[PDB]
Ligand binder design. Structure first.
Ligand SMILES: CC(=O)N[C@H]1[C@@H](O[C@H](COP(=O)(O)OC[C@H](O)[C@H](O)[C@H](O)CO)[C@@H](O)[C@@H](O)COP(=O)(O)OC[C@@H](O)[C@@H](O)[C@@H](O)CO)O[C@H](CO)[C@@H](O)[C@@H]1O
Ligand SMILES: O=S(=O)(O)C[C@@H](O)CNC1CCCCC1
Lengths: 219, 216
């Protein structure tokens, strides 16, 4: 089958600057009959199905802004976004349709590159309502930071926790180009009521040193 | 111009099969190709196969050969994707895609059908407060814990409060149940005057909860 290898995986580009996304076919995708490359580019955003931008490597689909362009040269395909706008934040995929079986590339996530912004950190103890149930969730919020890379370290009575937390991250905010992240530490009610000091320690390149938010159980 | 209407979300146990439908209207009903594309959590788009609903001809990706069957009913402009021997690797959104002729737009997509492969039973969430406890601004929220299947929606003050709201992607817990957090930042001065209610809806369990969140 024909493989499509995209690069890079992730691209950060300043507003109004040029984004370049690459895709390499494992074999020719050129028709000798019409000299067209059988390559498409798709844009995938939340709340909408994938959207065709470019077909036959370089033909823009109706309704696609002229800042999108495609190029094909043998096995190398490029999608260029000139004058990147916040609305262009998406995952982009190449696709070959040279063969009867089609192949997507793995995708490239495009974000707006803004200046580094440190997170604002907040910690929430488990509710008394939840404690009735035999589980405790401790929540740490990292608000409005850039870039997305951040380390959350939970500590309980200064013991570093590993494997008992989960986190998830918002899509980039369209107005300020930041991320937010929530981490949840799950522990038994018995363990929660045994220990005292609950801390969320945040490492981020916008901070000089890690920031800790903490509470003492019962205060 | 063209609508591809897909069947509703499905839950299946591992080893079961699922059949998803796609019904076209607006342009043609016979000689076009319908494709199926899926997206599993954290993964890229994956092309599954095509069917020509006029001829009934099909072609499947090698990794689904022997496990997928696509069929068509040209009389109701319908295409079906039947996937057998389901595992958690088949939890995904499944999209139908029409291949158009020359003249206009080259393709049209359905909105997707979510299939969840799990042994978990339908369960409505518990909703716990994240009570406000930082430089003129306070954070508060709702923890929406232990529900199945996806999705849940959260609004604030019946959708009147949008500024500073962040609703995180759900996480799947080792229990097989999902958890989601929604937060909002507000002026600290507002915590005395203004009420904050998170509106949680889990349609799969017919569970709607309004939780008022206040300082402890
Ligand atoms: C048009 C195109 O390039 N791709 C479409 C085409 O795929 C063909 C393979 O399909 P088959 O079912 O045939 O075989 C399955 C397997 O993938 C091989 C295609 O790859 C081949 O036809 C080769 O195309 P060309 O180099 O353009 O040569 C054509 C012609 O110029 C030549 O054959 C001589 O007549 C010239 O004298 O039909 C698919 C089915 O509808 C579509 O989904 C593809 O998008
Ligand atoms: O109105 S919406 O359907 O958007 C969300 C709905 O759950 C709100 N219910 C109200 C909450 C305040 C007290 C009266 C009941």
């Amino acid at each position: 089958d024909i493989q499509m290898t995209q690069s890079p995986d992730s691209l950060a580009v300043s507003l109004g600057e040029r984004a370049t996304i690459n895709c390499k076919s494992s074999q020719s995708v050129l028709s000798r009959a019409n000299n067209n490359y059988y390559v498409a580019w798709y844009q995938h955003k939340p709340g909408q199905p994938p959207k065709l931008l470019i077909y036959w490597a370089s033909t823009r689909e109706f309704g696609v802004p002229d800042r999108f362009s495609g190029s094909g040269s043998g096995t190398d395909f490029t999608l260029t976004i000139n004058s990147l706008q916040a609305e262009d934040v998406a995952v982009y995929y190449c696709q070959q349709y040279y063969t009867s079986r089609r192949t997507f590339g793995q995708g490239t996530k495009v974000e707006i590159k803004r200046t580094v912004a440190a997170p604002s950190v907040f910690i929430f103890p488990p509710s008394d309502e939840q404690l009735k149930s035999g589980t405790a969730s401790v929540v740490c919020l990292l608000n409005n930071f850039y870039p997305r890379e951040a380390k959350v370290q939970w500590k309980v009575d200064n013991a570093l926790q590993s494997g008992n937390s989960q986190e998830s991250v918002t899509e980039q905010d369209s107005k300020d180009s930041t991320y937010s992240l929530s981490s949840t530490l799950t522990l038994s009610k018995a363990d929660y009521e045994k220990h005292k000091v609950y801390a969320c320690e945040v490492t981020h390149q916008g901070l000089s040193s890690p920031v800790t938010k903490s509470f003492n159980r019962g205060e | 111009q063209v609508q591809l209407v897909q069947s509703g979300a499905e839950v299946r146990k591992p080893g079961a099969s699922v059949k998803v439908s796609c019904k076209a209207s607006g342009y043609s009903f016979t000689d076009y190709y319908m494709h199926w594309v899926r997206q599993a959590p954290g993964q890229g788009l994956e092309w599954m196969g095509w069917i020509n609903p006029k001829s009934g001809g099909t072609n499947y990706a090698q990794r689904f050969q022997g496990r997928v069957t696509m069929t068509g009913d040209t009389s109701i402009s319908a295409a079906y994707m039947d996937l057998a021997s389901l595992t958690s690797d088949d939890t995904a959104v499944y999209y139908c895609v029409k291949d158009c002729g020359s003249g206009g737009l080259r393709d049209f997509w359905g909105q997707g059908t979510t299939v969840t492969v799990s042994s978990a039973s339908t369960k409505g969430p518990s909703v716990f407060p994240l009570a406000p406890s930082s430089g003129g601004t306070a954070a508060l929220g709702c923890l929406v814990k232990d529900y199945f299947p996806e999705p849940v929606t959260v609004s604030w003050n019946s959708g009147a409060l949008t500024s500073g709201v962040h609703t995180f992607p759900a996480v799947l817990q080792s229990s097989g149940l999902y958890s989601l957090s929604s937060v909002v930042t507000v002026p600290s001065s507002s915590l005395g005057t203004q009420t904050y209610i998170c509106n949680v809806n889990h349609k799969p369990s017919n569970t709607k909860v309004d939780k008022k969140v206040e300082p402890k």
